Amino acid sequence: CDEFDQLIKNMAQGRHVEVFELLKPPSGGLGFSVVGLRSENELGIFVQEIQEGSVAHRDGRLKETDQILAINGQALDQTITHQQAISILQKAKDTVQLVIARGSLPQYYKV
């Protein structure tokens, strides 16, 4: 369990991390979209376009370019594909806990 905290620090690589909870409405979603970016050091899920009027938007904390490190205690490690990440996000009901890192890193900008 203390290992999870380290796993996150490793993913964050010195980025500011934050955990927060959002209530997903019974219909509408959290109100943001994501994209996968490959590093070299595997893959990250990054917030793209926060929908106006959404929980995500009205909550005010989440931002474009942040990386979702965890969802409801599940670290988004190599264990699962980017589409599996999205599926988890989509299938999550009610209070969703996200662990976030602020912005991206130069590693994800390599092509």
Swiss-Prot record:
Limits of the PDZ domain: 19-104
Expression sites by tissue: Expressed in heart, brain, placenta, liver, skeletal muscle, kidney and pancreas.
Subcellular location(s) per record: Cell membrane; Apical cell membrane; Postsynaptic density; Cell projection, Dendrite
Free-text note on domains in this protein's UniProt record: The PDZ domain 1 binds NG2. The PDZ domains 7 and 10 bind the Ad9 E4-ORF1 oncoprotein. The PDZ domain 9 binds F11R. The PDZ domain 10 binds the C-terminus of CLDN1 and KIT and the C-terminal PDZ-binding motif of HTR2C. The PDZ domain 13 binds CXADR. The PDZ domain 2 binds CAMK2A and CAMK2B. The PDZ domains 10 and 13 bind PLEKHA1 and PLEKHA2. The PDZ domain 13 binds SYNGAP1.
Linked pathology: Hydrocephalus, congenital, 2, with or without brain or eye anomalies: A form of congenital hydrocephalus, a disease characterized by onset in utero of enlarged ventricles due to accumulation of ventricular cerebrospinal fluid. HYC2 affected individuals have variable neurologic impairment. Some individuals have other brain abnormalities, including lissencephaly, thinning of the corpus callosum, and neuronal heterotopia. Most patients have delayed motor development and some have delayed intellectual development and/or seizures.
Known role: Member of the NMDAR signaling complex that may play a role in control of AMPAR potentiation and synaptic plasticity in excitatory synapses. Promotes clustering of HT2RC at the cell surface.
Quaternary structure note: Interacts with CLDN5, DLG4, GRIN1, F11R/JAM, CLDN1, NG2, CRB1, MPP4 and PALS1. Interacts with HTR2A, HTR2B, HTR2C, PLEKHA1/TAPP1, PLEKHA2/TAPP2, CXADR, SYNGAP1, CAMK2A and CAMK2B. Interacts with FAT4 (via cytoplasmic domain). Interacts with DLL1.
Protein name: Multiple PDZ domain protein
Lineage summary: Eukaryota, Metazoa, Chordata, Craniata, Vertebrata
Residues shown, of full length: 119 to 227 of 2070
